Amino acid sequence: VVIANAHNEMIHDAVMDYYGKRMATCSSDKTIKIFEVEGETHKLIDTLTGHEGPVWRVDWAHPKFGTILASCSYDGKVMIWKEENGRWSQIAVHAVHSASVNSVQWAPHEYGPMLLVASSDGKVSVVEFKENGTTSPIIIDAHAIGVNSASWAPATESRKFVTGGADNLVKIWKYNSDAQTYVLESTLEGHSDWVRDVAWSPTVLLRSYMASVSQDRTCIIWTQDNEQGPWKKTLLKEEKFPDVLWRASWSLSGNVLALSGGDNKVTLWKENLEGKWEPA
Template sequence: MAQVISNSGHDDMIHDAVLDYYGRRLATCSSDKTIKIFEIDGDQHKLQETLKGHEGAVWCVSWAHPKFGTLLASCSNDGRVHIYRESPSTSPSHPAQWTQVFTSTFHTASVNMVSWSPPDLGCLLACASSDGQVSVLEFRNNQWDHTIFAAHGMGVNAVSWAPSGALPGAIARKDGGQQNANAKRFATGGSDNMVKIWEYNQQTNTYTQMGVLPNGHSDWVRDVAWSPTLLSKTYIASASQDKTVKIWTSTNPADIGSWQLAKVLEFGDAVLWRVSWSLSGNVLAVSGSDGKVSLWKENLRGEWECVREITE
């Protein structure tokens, strides 16, 4: 969703703004082809760095988990994914420095979204492209490997990783939920109106489609978000050009047949751009073309209600 941040220093529309793990830094990206890093102090923000290198609008930025150092990924209309690393300050005369440590040129069209995996799966970055493919970059043995596969024929707009760990309802299961506990799994949303789930297959060394979520959208899926917390069930939300948000639930995400459409949120005339879960996994933020952000929560009766609306 395009946003305005006062005194951002960007010369054009801002497409993404993301806080780091500790909430101390904000990365923004824009149609002006740059990324800006701000230091956050209370309600003040101070520009720390401007990162260049893209040749088109930058759609999305994503911070890696700090266990891998200070890494920031970005993707652009130029078809490239950049990974930047900050080397810490060693002395006042040697301040912290940002360098571009890797560039992915595996896609032939705009890369629309990048998403880091949960850290216990490794240093993995999924990239969704308008060329219909998803690539997964992985840093191991001191180098960047990649796998790339066809996902949505008409273009991939969004990707979101499943949380890792014991599956929902694990306590009640004989294996304690450890089976597939660290499966590499994510959801994608495409211009074919579908939300698909993928899982890494060690035998074939690539990601295999587990299936398509039932009762999908009637227009492009703009965003998809897998709830980051392992509650009694797991949730996937998607935002679409068809002016609805859909929420699916499952008590066993490894079984594609267990996924059910739990709720359709309708938004009148607003095309929907982004969906995002709270860290606790039970509040969903929705934003769209009407400039509003609404927060939704499931009550004890299993009904979804709007608990807050913020107008920009």
């Protein structure tokens, strides 16, 4: 179902609506594109523009609040646009960070219309969209050099999300009505280089599963069982993948690992009966 040459500039992200019927591509050309996919067809609708620097990542909001797609660019700003009347418009612009923003994912509709922003400005922001338009932002420093990922943890307070460091550190953050904002929990060390990406699973089974990919060219699957329980570092393999590692994605169900390399190859992984990993 290829959509050959969607952009002019190299593409940095390919995400779909909750109903895999409409896509969203973003590139360096500072532009994002909306799509329609059927059997093998690709209808190109609008092309989102207002981004000064290369767009990095984008994320589809839950249909619960209509059609909304958020994008983050080098321009140190993340922007969201809705699709009222089949015509794409820019609803709000979030630019609190001072430097590139490399990741932006939406919170489980349960939580609400929340967006988690992680900038290379070393900080991270949490923003929910009220009514009138003016939101109440929440920012908290998260890493030394910077921040590269900010995946969320499923619903359960009890609001958690993992961060990937520019300083090689993976962290866990849980809300706190007494602290007024998300505070640190874990600080799982493991990578020798920078944490390129970290995604948290929705697999509600007995134990929690977290993925961490990095310039150190390895994935460390962080498995923990309960509050007490510490996270068990686990090398996806006791060798190095020839190139870096940029993305890690969790399948809806069946909990399978989508590990987008850098050697330009995508690999899939599963945890056999023991607790190790194998292809698919």
